[PDB]
Every structure is written in C-alpha cells, then in structure tokens.
C-alpha cells in the first residue's frame, strides 16, 4: 500500500519552519493584542451542540449568536459586533434549552462589559461611568467564557429509595419492540386501511 507511482519528489513538503512559524504567529498575536487593547483579543462565541449521533453528547463553541438570542438578551444586531459579540444569522433555535443557555451567556457578558464613551467629555447613559471604568479585566474570552461543562457528569449518587422501577418488560425488550414497530409501521397501516375499507364495503 505504497502510493509512490507518481513523481512524488516534486511535491514533498517538509516542515523545518515549524518553530519559526510558531514565533511568527506569536508575534502576530502580540501585535493584535497591543492594537486591540483594552478589548479582548477574540469575540464572544455561543455554546452549541455538535451534530451526528457520535458527537451530540458534547458541546463546543459555535460561530455566532442568533438574532433571536440577541433579541431576547436585548442587544441590537448592529451594536453586537461592535462590542465583541459574534453574530450568526444562519443558525436557528429549534429548542428552548440552547436558547436559554446562550441568552444567559449574553446577559453575563453584558453584566461584565465596560463600555467607554465615544467622546470622553460627553458621556451617554448607555456608557460606563468613569468611576466604574477601572477594574481588573480579561483579554481572553475563549478562556473566561469557554465551555465549562462540555460533557454530562459521568457519575452521580441517589438514595436507594429513589432507584427507578425501569421500563416494563426490560430495556432489551423495549429496544427490540421499538425496532420491530419501526420496521412494521407501514404494513400495519396498510392492513388497517384495508380492514377499514372492507368494513365500509360490508358494513
């Protein structure tokens, strides 16, 4: 299983520039942080659940918050990308739980936000006052607003009187019955339709 039948020597990529590229990336990050100070170096991201049945046990960071999440948090969609919040217009909220989690995330960020006035001599009422502008800040939203609990807890404890009775017949029999019903959903519907037609014909 050796794929060396093409002119492979023309397209060999070595990586001797790995430490140099790491140094260049760190220099670029330092320059971006110095240019963006006192703002954090990154944008606030929502918590999303990974697709497919393999990865839906785990949550991670998404692209941006939804318009519904911004509306429920009270943050206008034009103000949001100017105060460090990422916006994603494609994503929708199919269920209430993720919507509530991301709305609470936005409200925590809004409670921790310090908003400097556009003009120092003319502050507005949406702006943070000068007596509150001084506080210990964070510069990594991926760290301070990360995924705290990416998986469910793998172990809890309950009293022995709170042990559930379980599904009737057993979980194995419940799984077998669910698979059988899914396989026979159409045949039983056709049989019921034929029986109803026969009953209507010979009532």
């Amino acid at each position: 299983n050796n794929h060396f039948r093409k002119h492979w020597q023309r397209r060999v990529r070595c990586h001797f520039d790995q430490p140099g590229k790491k140094v260049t990336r760190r220099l670029a990050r330092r320059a971006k942080a110095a240019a963006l100070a006192p703002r954090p170096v990154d944008k606030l991201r929502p918590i999303v659940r990974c697709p497919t049945v393999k990865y839906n046990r785990r949550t991670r960071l998404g692209r941006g918050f939804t318009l519904e999440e911004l509306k429920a948090a009270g943050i206008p969609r034009l103000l949001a990308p100017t105060i460090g919040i990422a916006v994603d217009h494609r994503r929708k909220n199919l269920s209430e739980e993720s919507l509530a989690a991301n709305v609470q995330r936005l409200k925590d960020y809004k409670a921790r936000l310090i908003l400097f006035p556009r003009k120092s001599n003319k502050p507005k009422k949406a702006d943070t006052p000068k007596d509150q502008q001084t506080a210990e800040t964070t510069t990594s939203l991926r760290t301070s607003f990360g995924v705290e609990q990416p998986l469910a807890p793998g172990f809890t404890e309950i009293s022995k009187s709170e042990i559930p009775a379980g599904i009737e017949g057993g979980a194995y029999r419940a799984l077998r019955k669910a698979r059988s019903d899914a396989r026979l959903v159409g045949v039983r519907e056709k049989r019921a339709k034929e029986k109803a037609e026969a009953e209507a014909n010979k009532k």
Partner: protein, 108 residues
C-alpha cells in the same frame, strides 16, 4: 546508523453488498462489558462502595459521558445496586444488573 550495517562488513565481498456514501458516525456505538462497569466510578467512591460504607446510596453511571453507547455482559457484578444509563444494552448485561439489584435506564 550507517556504521552498524551489513554493507560495511560486506565491503570487499560484493464481497456482499456495496454501501455508497458510507458515514461512519451512523454506526458509532462503543461497548463496555459489565466487568469494567465499576472502573468508571472514581476510585475513592468505588472503594467506599465496595467496602460497604454506602448502604443507603446507589451509583448512577452515564455511559455516554464516558464514551460508551452499549452495555455488554461479559463478567460478573458485585451485589450492589447500580443505576446504569445507556443507549443500548445486551440481555445478559441487563439480567446481571437486575440480579445485582440495579436498573438499566434507556437514554438517547
């Protein structure tokens, strides 16, 4: 290293069905036998449960958090009631959990 090779010494002497667009994530269901079930409990709590200092509590184990979807039934269990939450379970694994005095809860 070239000085250790034999060349230096030899110097002077020379079926079934096809499945189009297979997605492996459809078939993700890792399995754990019941003889490894107590190893998912943290060590101090596991030793307390096995010693018998917890006679009023039962451990609830989420297999999907540990990365398992099916509970298989190789081995034997101690006589301690355990709540197990799993996507799939074998008949023998359920039978052994029920003898141990716990229950297998189905999740998705």
């Amino acid at each position: 290293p070239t000085r250790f090779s034999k060349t230096r010494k030899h110097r002077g002497h020379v079926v079934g069905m096809r499945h189009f667009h297979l997605l492996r994530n459809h078939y993700w269901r890792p399995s754990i036998n019941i003889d490894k079930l107590w190893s998912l409990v943290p060590s101090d709590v596991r030793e307390q449960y096995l010693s018998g200092q917890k006679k009023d509590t039962a451990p609830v184990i989420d297999l999907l958090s540990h990365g398992y979807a099916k509970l298989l039934g190789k081995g034997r269990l101690p006589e301690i009631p355990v709540v197990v939450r799993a996507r799939y379970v074998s008949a023998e694994a359920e039978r052994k959990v029920k003898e141990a005095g716990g229950v297998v809860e189905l999740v998705a």
